Design a binder for this molecule. Structure first.
Ligand SMILES: COc1ccc(C(=O)N2CCCc3cc(C4=NNC(=O)S[C@@H]4C)ccc32)cc1OC
Ligand SMILES: [Ca+2]
Ligand SMILES: [Ca+2]
Length: 71
């Protein structure tokens, strides 16, 4: 369930630069915050499949997809 209700927050929950776009520079900070010591295959491997735009970040579209009610 949850719906876009939780997804909306998640986006910001992940956004630490208040820009409306997540980046790798932040991702790592997200992991180290929830448990560093994470292989590099978890930062890119995750972003890659979450970077349909291939810009090095996430959007309100791709994010809403990869963020199908996470956390
Ligand atoms: C409790 O322990 C953890 C907490 C968060 C993470 C974590 O990195 N998570 C948790 C769920 C949301 C989440 C989303 C992403 C993303 N990936 N891909 C996208 O396209 S959007 C978004 C930026 C990347 C990582 C994580 C990992 C943990 O252990 C493996
Ligand atoms: Ca951000
Ligand atoms: Ca993207």
């Amino acid at each position: 369930g949850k719906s876009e209700e939780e997804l909306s927050d998640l986006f910001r929950m992940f956004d630490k630069n208040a820009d409306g776009y997540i980046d790798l520079e932040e991702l790592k900070i997200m992991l180290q915050a929830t448990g560093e010591t994470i292989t590099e295959d978890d930062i890119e491997e995750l972003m890659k499949d979450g970077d349909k735009n291939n810009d090095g970040r996430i959007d309100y579209d791709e994010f809403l997809e990869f963020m199908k009610g996470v956390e």
